[PDB]
DNA sequence: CACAAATCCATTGACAAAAGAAGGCTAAAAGGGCATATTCCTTTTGAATTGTCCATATAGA
């Protein structure tokens, strides 16, 4: 039981690895597609959180 | 000063309105799911502290 849990949460871990990495490649889209809202009320990083 | 009558306070009873609920409804409020490609924002005055040189005293050469 402990070797499969233990695989399991290995590749849950890398899971999460490479969900981070591709989020952090496209801040830089969220970014871009946050500017355009800029100032119907709520604050910039607002935007890009919820982005 | 006793006996005969009109005038009061209490229950029966029913009856209508009124409210607490319950269901049936409907307006509305909240999720969820979208796949050609989108990649870095728009006036002084004074005091006190903090970061910067200066006097200087001492320790090795």
């Known amino acids: 039981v402990k070797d499969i849990n233990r695989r399991m949460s290995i ?8 969900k981070k990495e591709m989020v952090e490649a496209n801040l830089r ?3 871009s ?3 355009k809202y800029t100032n119907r009320g709520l604050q ?5 959180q919820e982005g």
């Not at 590749?11 to 490479?18: D, F, S, T």
């Not at 910039?44 to 890009?48: C, E, G």
């Open 11 to 18: 590749g849950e871990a890398k899971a999460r690895r490479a």
């Open 44 to 48: 910039f990083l607002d935007l890009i």
């Open 29 to 31: 889209l969220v970014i």
């Open 33 to 35: 597609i946050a500017k």
